[PDB]
Amino acid sequence: MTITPQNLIALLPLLIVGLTVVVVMLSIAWRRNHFLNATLSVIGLNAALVSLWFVGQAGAMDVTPLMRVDGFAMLYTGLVLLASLATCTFAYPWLEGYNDNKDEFYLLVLIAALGGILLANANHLASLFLGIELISLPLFGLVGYAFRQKRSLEASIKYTILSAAASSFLLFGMALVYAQSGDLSFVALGKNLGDGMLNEPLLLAGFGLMIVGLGFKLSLVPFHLWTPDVYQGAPAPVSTFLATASKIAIFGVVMRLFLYAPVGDSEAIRVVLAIIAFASIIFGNLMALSQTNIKRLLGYSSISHLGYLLVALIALQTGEMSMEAVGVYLAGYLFSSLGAFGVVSLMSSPYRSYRGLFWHRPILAAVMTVMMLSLAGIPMTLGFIGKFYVLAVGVQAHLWWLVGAVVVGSAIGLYYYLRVAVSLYLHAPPSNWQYSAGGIVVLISALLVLVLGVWPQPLISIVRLAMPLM
Amino acid sequence: MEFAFYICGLIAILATLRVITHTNPVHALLYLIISLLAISGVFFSLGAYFAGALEIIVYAGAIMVLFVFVVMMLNLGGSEIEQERQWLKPQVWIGPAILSAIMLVVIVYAILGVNDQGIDGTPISAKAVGITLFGPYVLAVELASMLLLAGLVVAFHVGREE
Amino acid sequence: MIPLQHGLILAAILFVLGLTGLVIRRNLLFMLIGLEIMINASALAFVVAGSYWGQTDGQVMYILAISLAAAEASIGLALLLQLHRRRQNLNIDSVSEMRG
Amino acid sequence: STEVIAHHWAFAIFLIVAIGLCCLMLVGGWFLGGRARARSKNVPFESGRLSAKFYLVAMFFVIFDVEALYLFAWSTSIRESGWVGFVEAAIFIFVLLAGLVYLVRIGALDWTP
Amino acid sequence: LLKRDPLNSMMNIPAVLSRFAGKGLLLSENGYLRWYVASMSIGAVVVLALLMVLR
Numbered sequence A: 001m002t003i004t005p006q007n008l009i010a011l012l013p014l015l016i017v018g019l020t021v022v023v024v025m026l027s028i029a030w031r032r033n034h035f036l037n038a039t040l041s042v043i044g045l046n047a048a049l050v051s052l053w054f055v056g057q058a059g060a061m062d063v064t065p066l067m068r069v070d071g072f073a074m075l076y077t078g079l080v081l082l083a084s085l086a087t088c089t090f091a092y093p094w095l096e097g098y099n100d101n102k103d104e105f106y107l108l109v110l111i112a113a114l115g116g117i118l119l120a121n122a123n124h125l126a127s128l129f130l131g132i133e134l135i136s137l138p139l140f141g142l143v144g145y146a147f148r149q150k151r152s153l154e155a156s157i158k159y160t161i162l163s164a165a166a167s168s169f170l171l172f173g174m175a176l177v178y179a180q181s182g183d184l185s186f187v188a189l190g191k192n193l194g195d196g197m198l199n200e201p202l203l204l205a206g207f208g209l210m211i212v213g214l215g216f217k218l219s220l221v222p223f224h225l226w227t228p229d230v231y232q233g234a235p236a237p238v239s240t241f242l243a244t245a246s247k248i249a250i251f252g253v254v255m256r257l258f259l260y261a262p263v264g265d266s267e268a269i270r271v272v273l274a275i276i277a278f279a280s281i282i283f284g285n286l287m288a289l290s291q292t293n294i295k296r297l298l299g300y301s302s303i304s305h306l307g308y309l310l311v312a313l314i315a316l317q318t319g320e321m322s323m324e325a326v327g328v329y330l331a332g333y334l335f336s337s338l339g340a341f342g343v344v345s346l347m348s349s350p351y352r353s354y355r356g357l358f359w360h361r362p363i364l365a366a367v368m369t370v371m372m373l374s375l376a377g378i379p380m381t382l383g384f385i386g387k388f389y390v391l392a393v394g395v396q397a398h399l400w401w402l403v404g405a406v407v408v409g410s411a412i413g414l415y416y417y418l419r420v421a422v423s424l425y426l427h428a429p430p431s432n433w434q435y436s437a438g439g440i441v442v443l444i445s446a447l448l449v450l451v452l453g454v455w456p457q458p459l460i461s462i463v464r465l466a467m468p469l470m
Numbered sequence B: 001m002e003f004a005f006y007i008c009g010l011i012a013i014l015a016t017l018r019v020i021t022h023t024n025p026v027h028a029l030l031y032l033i034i035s036l037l038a039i040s041g042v043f044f045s046l047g048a049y050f051a052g053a054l055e056i057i058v059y060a061g062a063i064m065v066l067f068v069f070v071v072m073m074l075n076l077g078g079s080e081i082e083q084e085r086q087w088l089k090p091q092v093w094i095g096p097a098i099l100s101a102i103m104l105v106v107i108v109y110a111i112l113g114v115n116d117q118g119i120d121g122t123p124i125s126a127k128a129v130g131i132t133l134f135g136p137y138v139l140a141v142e143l144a145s146m147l148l149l150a151g152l153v154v155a156f157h158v159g160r161e162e
Numbered sequence C: 001m002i003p004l005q006h007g008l009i010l011a012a013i014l015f016v017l018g019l020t021g022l023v024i025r026r027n028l029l030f031m032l033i034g035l036e037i038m039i040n041a042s043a044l045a046f047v048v049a050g051s052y053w054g055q056t057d058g059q060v061m062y063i064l065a066i067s068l069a070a071a072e073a074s075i076g077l078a079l080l081l082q083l084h085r086r087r088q089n090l091n092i093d094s095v096s097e098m099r100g
Numbered sequence D: 001s002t003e004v005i006a007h008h009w010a011f012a013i014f015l016i017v018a019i020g021l022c023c024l025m026l027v028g029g030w031f032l033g034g035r036a037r038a039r040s041k042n043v044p045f046e047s048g049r050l051s052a053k054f055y056l057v058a059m060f061f062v063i064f065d066v067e068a069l070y071l072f073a074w075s076t077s078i079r080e081s082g083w084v085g086f087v088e089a090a091i092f093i094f095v096l097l098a099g100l101v102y103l104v105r106i107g108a109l110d111w112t113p
Numbered sequence E: 001l002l003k004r005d006p007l008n009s010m011m012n013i014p015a016v017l018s019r020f021a022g023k024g025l026l027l028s029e030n031g032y033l034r035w036y037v038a039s040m041s042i043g044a045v046v047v048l049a050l051l052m053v054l055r
């Protein structure tokens, strides 16, 4: 299929972010200016976020034998773009203290955002693979951006080796799937099977290797052991981006792949993902019980939240609001993780103990305790709305083991989240507008969490508007 | 056609087995180059002429050149590598080998249970691959250029000397 | 006349051999070598799958595979170079400071 | 056909005879000629750490060789791709030249300090 | 006999079970990359075997 001007206007955030990559690269080639390159990157990401309006007025259509644009793609593109914008905003005061070159950071953030947009728009195995790699490799650079530090270099090496292994696993999986089916489109993965013979062994093994790669990319048990180390060792804006944008884009493409494929309603795949989600929730909540480090704690939190996401994933073909639950939960999780990792970044900036935070930084302490109440699914917070959606979807499809796992993991998460949120207020022994901009970002994130936890109807209507093709 | 395929596959398997059980990095890289040549012969036997040409041009001509370059600059004299031989120590290698073994039997069970009409070996020229590459696969080309650019920027930022 | 199953078996054998070399070797260079073996075996499987169906999609996926392999080898060798520059060893078990 | 298999046989004979020719050249060089010993004969001739710029140059060769393979695939199918494929390849070369200019200006391709 | 509240300890038994399970599960995070790759291959074997059994 050729490309039309309507297909070009469907390509608007991808083209805008790519043009931003080229412009920022040429500006770095002209003269190394941190402020101007950061401003150009933020301008390009905001331009793509604005041009999502024109993409929405363009309608839902198919641009490539690879790409499909609908409201689902707009919602995930907007989430990825917002996460990238917050990552740049948090990264500028951190990069104010970096002795080496700071301008490549925003180039890598823009390329990873480009990969996230491609993963949001992906309707093909090639686009899935290229979006995963386009997210992964700039994250290899960003995790080891402070390569002089021991922890950052260790996390970069671990992430690079493990993600190369997961990329090979995923690629061999789609190789087996394409050997079985003969078409790499999402809709044709198992379309040549009928009369109850959907569980062909080669297709199931290829999808299993794809599950191995994606469950690495989604921090799902037992491909989750990288998450606390890579989260801790990486810089805190990089931890923010890796927690929000990569996970959201990869889960969106997994959502689209399991909706569109005929093999997605297989019983064996459903049971395997049920086991993975159960173990992910239980293990991620249990392993964060005795964590004194905030970053590893939030990595195990990411594992648990992705387990709740997979619980919402499993009931896709049976329930009707599974995608709506995933969208509401992902908006809430983006806001909560953005706020928490942003306060962590603002306390880690510039590049050179959360106890007693209220006595010198009260606003950041309030924002942190709002997000740790949000990640626990406490009412008046958007994470509660997401957990309620997950529980409703689990109750509809009679996923009782998953529902009990969500309740037990919620209790354990309540324990450690409240431990940190109340360690904030105990007793223990800047001056630029970009730090204030990061503070405004985390403050609006906390206000959004509180308002959409009290009044979740506009977000529900927005997510219900983001309906993919049938 | 089939005889060349089976001979090249056997050569690639034996060469890869020699890579994963060697102590000399240059010998391991040379055996890896030999396996890449054999897999290129497999590609040429199956009619994917462009794939084999790219295996020897790029995989056996650029990437392994980069690996050989790095091994040259490290001056690897086997310090605590040849003096350890811990991979040849059995209780280290029995576990992962049996892991890959049971994974291989599961994948072989998957492979043997599929329809196979045979590969006719019709040669697919690079002209058709180029037509497809700039036809139904255009975003793949541009975003792969961006991926190579990302790798360029990342490894330039990491691999400086100062 | 070449069976598809034999080519897929060869690709799977090279894949699991690359994984074995990735696991059992402490040296980061040999793990990078094993990763290259795994991704090249996956590219071989995709080429065989494309050749059975008479489609150029297998070779296109091979091209994307080797683009990823080249860029990943570049990044991994840069990380190995910095590890050898500041640590004077390639032991991947020595870099284990972050745990628990 | 007969002509194609005759071409395959001729190519196989070419490769085999070339490899056997250099192998027999080695065999003749090693087998013929007397051998004699000296004390410093085995010592390497030395007239009586490497920089990372080598790695950078080889890395740039690898990356631009992959983009060269993309242009290789384009160049053999230029007429059937039409003006649309020309626009796509122009964007591709624009990205390539932007990356090259960025490498030039930051001194990545500058060998001398 | 009851001054130590036995039912309170009976319902606090899940708390110590969760603590013990978390302490045991944290041993898998030893920080070694080779063990991480081995765990990924273990998960691949387990997922593939479960998919073959339930098919």
Ligand SMILES: CCCCCCCCCCCCCCCCCC(=O)OC[C@H](COP(=O)(O)OCCN)OC(=O)CCCCCCCCCCCCCCCCC
Pocket: B001, B003, B004, B007, B008, B011, B034, B037, B038, B040, B041, B042, B044, B045, B046, B047, B121, D001, D004, D005, D008, D012
């Ligand atoms: C002899 C016993 C073993 C001795 C030691 C090993 C020596 C090397 C063995 C491997 C290379 C040679 C294999 C034999 C090839 C003989 C020619 C042949 O089989 O041609 C068939 C086919 C011709 O093309 P096609 O169109 O498919 O033909 C159908 C008829 N019209 O051909 C094709 O389609 C492609 C033919 C193969 C690809 C070209 C050659 C690749 C060479 C790779 C070398 C790898 C490294 C070897 C290292 C050896 C030492 C360790």
Ligand SMILES: CCCCCCCCCCCCCCCCCCCC
Pocket: B095, B096, B098, B099, C093, E032, E034, E035, E038, E042, E045, E046
């Ligand atoms: C210092 C750290 C060293 C880490 C070495 C890790 C080695 C892992 C070996 C795994 C062996 C598995 C054997 C088979 C287990 C049962 C079958 C698979 C699971 C069902």
